[PDB]
Design an enzyme around this catalytic site. Structure first.
Site, short mmCIF file in Angstrom:
data_model
loop_
_atom_site.label_atom_id
_atom_site.label_comp_id
_atom_site.label_asym_id
_atom_site.label_seq_id
_atom_site.Cartn_x
_atom_site.Cartn_y
_atom_site.Cartn_z
N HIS A 61 0.81 -1.22 0.00
CA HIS A 61 0.00 0.00 0.00
C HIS A 61 0.84 1.26 0.00
CE1 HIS A 61 -3.40 -2.58 0.82
NE2 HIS A 61 -2.78 -3.06 1.88
N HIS A 91 5.81 6.91 6.54
CA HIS A 91 5.48 6.52 5.19
C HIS A 91 4.91 7.73 4.48
CE1 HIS A 91 1.78 6.08 7.52
NE2 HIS A 91 1.18 6.51 6.41
N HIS A 93 1.96 9.07 1.24
CA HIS A 93 0.89 8.89 0.27
C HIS A 93 1.18 9.84 -0.88
CE1 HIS A 93 -1.53 6.74 3.32
NE2 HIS A 93 -0.89 7.55 4.15
N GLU A 103 -3.44 13.42 1.45
CA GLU A 103 -4.68 12.98 2.08
C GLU A 103 -5.43 14.16 2.68
OE1 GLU A 103 -3.58 9.36 4.37
OE2 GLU A 103 -4.47 8.43 2.61
N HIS A 116 3.67 10.92 6.69
CA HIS A 116 3.07 10.57 7.98
C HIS A 116 4.13 9.95 8.87
CE1 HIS A 116 -1.20 10.42 6.06
NE2 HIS A 116 -0.80 11.65 6.34
N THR A 195 -5.88 6.40 8.23
CA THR A 195 -6.47 6.67 6.92
C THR A 195 -6.50 5.45 6.01
OG1 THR A 195 -4.41 7.35 5.89
CG2 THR A 195 -5.68 9.07 7.04
C1 LIG Z 1 -1.64 -3.17 15.48
C2 LIG Z 1 -1.41 -3.33 13.98
C3 LIG Z 1 -0.85 -4.49 13.48
C4 LIG Z 1 -0.64 -4.63 12.11
C5 LIG Z 1 -0.03 -5.90 11.52
C6 LIG Z 1 -1.00 -3.61 11.25
C7 LIG Z 1 -1.56 -2.45 11.77
N1 LIG Z 1 -1.93 -1.41 10.85
C8 LIG Z 1 -1.49 -0.04 10.99
O1 LIG Z 1 -0.79 0.34 11.86
N2 LIG Z 1 -1.96 0.83 9.95
C9 LIG Z 1 -1.74 2.24 9.81
C10 LIG Z 1 -2.65 2.75 8.92
C11 LIG Z 1 -2.65 4.08 8.63
C12 LIG Z 1 -1.74 4.90 9.25
S1 LIG Z 1 -1.90 6.62 8.74
N3 LIG Z 1 -1.95 6.68 7.10
O2 LIG Z 1 -3.31 7.15 9.34
O3 LIG Z 1 -0.58 7.43 9.28
C13 LIG Z 1 -0.79 4.42 10.16
C14 LIG Z 1 -0.80 3.05 10.45
C15 LIG Z 1 -1.77 -2.30 13.12
ZN LIG Z 2 -0.53 7.53 6.20
#
Ligand SMILES: Cc1cc(C)cc(NC(=O)Nc2ccc(S(N)(=O)=O)cc2)c1
Ligand SMILES: [Zn+2]
Length: 257
Positions: A61, A91, A93, A103, A116, A195
């Site tokens: 992703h 990371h 986007h 975003e 982010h 997100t």
């Molecule tokens: C606890 C846990 C375990 C695993 C294997 C995956 C995740 N997923 C996760 O941390 N996703 C995540 C999604 C979006 C953002 S954002 N784009 O809002 O900064 C950060 C982490 C969370």
């Molecule tokens: Zn993000």
């Protein structure tokens, strides 16, 4: 399984993740005339001197640069936050075109990309516990516009060849995330969510006013990544952003006037 295409993209997510239609979803449009200056907001404290980067991963992703979060090494404090949040990963986007990719938006303006820096609240012990809490994460969001190169980003750009496809990782030690920050730490803040699925409503969003500038060549190399795994038909990793969600019963606060 979810993604960013016409058949598994943001319009579909609510079927597996009904919180997609929840009360504090991210990202949002930041209407700068409606955000209210809050003089009680404290300056952000970004303490990245002891950051320990470990690895960079294409997760299908985006790509994550991962840090050692088993100790208070790189932490975010202050601003709207109570307590100490540890940096676990960053990371981005980004878009297929320079006019889209962020975003969050600012007065409906879309930037070419958005960084982010993801942090979790140490009172909850681990990241998996933290994402289950309304104050579990703090994500520092930084807009990218295309113009001059960002020198501190180039080491990220240069390793992307080695993690082209989903599931590939590479060692990425000794990376200093302070080289990704703009000069000013003025920010907007609101309560929101992850997100991407599972879209958990666990994030204090802190979005910096000042974008960083990256070169057209730098973001072009983001766009050569692949959503697919090796040996699968090539799907360019572009437009991995969720659009702005309804603000509902929330106020965006500004640390500045
Ligand atoms: C606890 C846990 C375990 C695993 C294997 C995956 C995740 N997923 C996760 O941390 N996703 C995540 C999604 C979006 C953002 S954002 N784009 O809002 O900064 C950060 C982490 C969370
Ligand atoms: Zn993000």
């Amino acid at each position: 399984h979810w993604g960013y295409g016409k058949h598994n993209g943001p319009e579909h997510w609510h079927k597996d993740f009904p919180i997609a239609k929840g009360e504090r979803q991210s990202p949002v449009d930041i209407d700068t005339h409606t955000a209210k200056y809050d003089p009680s907001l404290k300056p952000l404290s970004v303490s990245y001197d002891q950051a320990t980067s470990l690895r960079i991963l294409n997760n299908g992703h985006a790509f994550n640069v991962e840090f050692d979060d088993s100790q208070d090494k790189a932490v975010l404090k202050g601003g709207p936050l109570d307590g100490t949040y540890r940096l676990i990963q960053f990371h981005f986007h980004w878009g297929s075109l320079d006019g889209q990719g962020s975003e969050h938006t600012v007065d409906k303006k879309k930037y070419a990309a958005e960084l982010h820096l993801v942090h979790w609240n140490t009172k909850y012990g681990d990241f998996g516990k933290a994402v289950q809490q309304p104050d579990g994460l703090a994500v520092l969001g930084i807009f990218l516009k295309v113009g001059s190169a960002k020198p501190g980003l180039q080491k990220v750009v240069d390793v992307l060849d080695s993690i082209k496809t989903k599931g590939k990782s590479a060692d990425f030690t000794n990376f200093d995330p302070r080289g990704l920050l703009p000069e000013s730490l003025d920010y907007w803040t609101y309560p929101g969510s992850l997100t991407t699925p599972p879209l958990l409503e666990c994030v204090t969003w802190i979005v910096l006013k000042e974008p960083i500038s990256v070169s057209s060549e730098q973001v072009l190399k983001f766009r050569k990544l692949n959503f697919n795994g090796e040996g699968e038909p090539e799907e360019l990793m572009v437009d991995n952003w969720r659009p702005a969600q309804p603000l509902k019963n929330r106020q965006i606060k500004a640390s500045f006037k």
